[PDB]
Design a protein around this ligand. Sequence first.
Ligand SMILES: COc1ccc(C2=NN(C(C)C)C(=O)[C@@H]3CC=CC[C@H]23)cc1C#CC(=O)NCc1ccccc1
Ligand SMILES: [Mg+2]
Ligand SMILES: [Zn+2]
Length: 327
Amino acid sequence: GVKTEQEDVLAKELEDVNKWGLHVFRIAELSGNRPLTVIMHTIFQERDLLKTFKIPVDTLITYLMTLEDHYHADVAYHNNIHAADVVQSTHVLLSTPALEAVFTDLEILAAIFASAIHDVDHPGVSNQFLINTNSELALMYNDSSVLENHHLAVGFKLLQEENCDIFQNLTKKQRQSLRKMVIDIVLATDMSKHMNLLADLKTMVETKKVTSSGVLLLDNYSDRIQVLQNMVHCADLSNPTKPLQLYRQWTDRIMEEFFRQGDRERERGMEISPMCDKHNASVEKSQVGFIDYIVHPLWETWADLVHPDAQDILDTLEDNREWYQST
Ligand SMILES: COc1ccc(C2=NN(C(C)C)C(=O)[C@@H]3CC=CC[C@H]23)cc1C#CC(=O)NCc1ccccc1
Ligand SMILES: [Mg+2]
Ligand SMILES: [Zn+2]
């Protein structure tokens, strides 16, 4: 009852779980394509979430495997590795010193669970694509945040699977609170909400309060959920803040996915999408624009909220930005 050698090299990689720039791809490999399961497990143990919420470990594992298996292995970007990465990144963001002892264990569980489910059963195409193709998912969710609503529905329906109810010992009060938070968080990962989340984050930073010296004061649900919503959205838009070896893989995967959507948008005679076209796109200027217009404004406002904790991350983003510019 000691680890195999593979289990051991995995456990040594997993000591980076609290670091920005974990070797998540390596984790995926070493875990037999189980990054989401192993990383969630580690985080749950680290944060003592099993004891706090009286989660049987077999139940946790069973749910996690089930959740991981409803990510599509044939989708290059929006798969279980991306889920794992958003989870781990949210995990690191929650540990930021500006937020020390701000959040309850239920809010922590919410942010992390939300991260893990937030792209589950993603088909590798966009909301617009789905809406324009008259897809069942678009009709189900009356064309409004189609994917997000689906990810939430799937992540919650899976709890009904044999020995999958990880929330089985929570009170009704706890469950209702957790559910609301998770819905609010995942719905906020729809890029059509980015501007309003960013605005709200900007106004919160201007009127920012602090107590005991250092630590943010959030004394209402609106503010509390806003911070968690923006935290996970930062995690979701965190690829360009990661070391370049990591960042480049992410870009490659998203391009495959978008070019493949583009291929389907000519295989279907449709109108091609913003940056979804091979022998006809600049990958580098698009990334620069992605960084200038979306990723930097968000991370700069975050870094401002948690000053000085996000400096190295904002630095790395600015370096990667310079790097991509040279081409
Ligand atoms: C690592 O790169 C990426 C990683 C992620 C995304 C995502 N984009 N969007 C929207 C912004 C198109 C999503 O809704 C996705 C779903 C959820 C969140 C983020 C996802 C885009 C890129 C890129 C790029 C790239 O080269 N040109 C694309 C681009 C160029 C200029 C301006 C905006 C985008
Ligand atoms: Mg998403
Ligand atoms: Zn995502």
